[PDB]
Amino acid sequence: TGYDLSASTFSPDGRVFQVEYAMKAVENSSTAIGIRCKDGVVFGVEKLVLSKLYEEGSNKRLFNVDRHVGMAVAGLLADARSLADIAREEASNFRSNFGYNIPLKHLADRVAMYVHAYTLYSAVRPFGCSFMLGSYSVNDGAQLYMIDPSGVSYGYWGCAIGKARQAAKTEIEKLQMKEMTCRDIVKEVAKIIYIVHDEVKDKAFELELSWVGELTNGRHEIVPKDIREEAEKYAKESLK
Template identity: 35%
Template sequence: MGGNDQQAYDRGTSLFSPDGRIYQVEYAREAVSRGAPSVGVRTADGVVFVAMSRASSTLMEAESIEKLHKLDDHLGTASAGHVADARQLIDLARRQSQGNRLRYGEAVGVETLTKFVTDHIQENTQRGGTRPYGAALLIGGIENGEPRLFAADPSGTPNEWKATVIGGGRSDIQGHLEEEWTEGLSLDAGVELGIAALAAHDDEFEPADLAVATVTEADGYRTVPVEEVAEAFAAAGLTTEDEDEDEDEDDEGADADGEAGADDDDEE
């Protein structure tokens, strides 16, 4: 009987278990943790998003992997978890942002938009016949000239952050961010920090495996080209596989020269 009672709470999307848990929300969080990580960093100049967007197959078009999205000229978002669920939330956020401009003639606030989205997410944990969204979002942008960064998880809780991560490898990546983030960080340093934080969990990736975007007051939402990502990749102290192979070849060449020199000495 105890097992059947447990299954009843397990299947209910809007029921609390006797120990105060909603299992479906916890399962949705688990779905997010299985997704590729996305990092958000608040800097003195704006907000930085860095997401892992590595293709799962060489036959897949890398451009079709969308982890970062523009919500408005001053707003961007990064996602983790189920892609289809994330897209529904992103479309909702875009409609609300556009509606705010049409209705009030001004840009929507970062906090206001985040709470609108999280209110919608929370409804799916309270009503029967629905399931929680299996996705999390980072929403960041400029509000009254100041950069702000929020995270929205499947429970519908909005939290403001200086730097955070959603998706897999959270423990390692968040630990790196907590150690390295400083007040007054520049935008370029924020990009480097985001890349280095992802490397704290998995360092086997190339600049082309990353999607990077920034939101500043001067430029608005901007997708960072791969050439600039590669520069930040190197500035963060990371190397590509090609560079590692070149170093190995140089080492092998040096060893070969050393052995040849030793043989010459023996002949003399």
């Protein structure tokens, strides 16, 4: 047990062992992957759904951070909701003060500052969630940043969080993610989500896709997979 009781006392060995419980908490939640295509970022998140007593789209884990900034989370859902509200507050503050759109790098670093500050005070605890932010500024390119419960903000060409981070990352690694366009990337993401334990032991779940991209006009949208369900057909074809 040592001194691993609060995230403000430096435990035996430099590792606090307090936030390394928040990483375990993030490990509990289901997987959530994200891929930066040529013109946009595709957020593919699986949310485990007990079809019993559900609402076919309740408590979805995709949220809007900004008119152009989309996000995905893994871990505690309440912390995700609160920090999505915080990110919306930060984006609105930048929008009102600077008179133009917030760069994704600055938003990501400020949210990471919020997370890191919450990791420190004794009276508060680090968030039990890790998340991944995407945006496209038509002026210069596309931006993506993944932040952990410790507050480490790093970029990824493609990333994953949740219960299958390394498996999903290995699946992403063989994608020709250098050049292709987000349209086929949606199907790639769907089949990658399904290949890693779609419903093998857990009964049922739902797949949600978020999309920011130049062809999507650059704003943040939920991919309307209702059209021909091509990614869903691909994911179920991934059966073998």
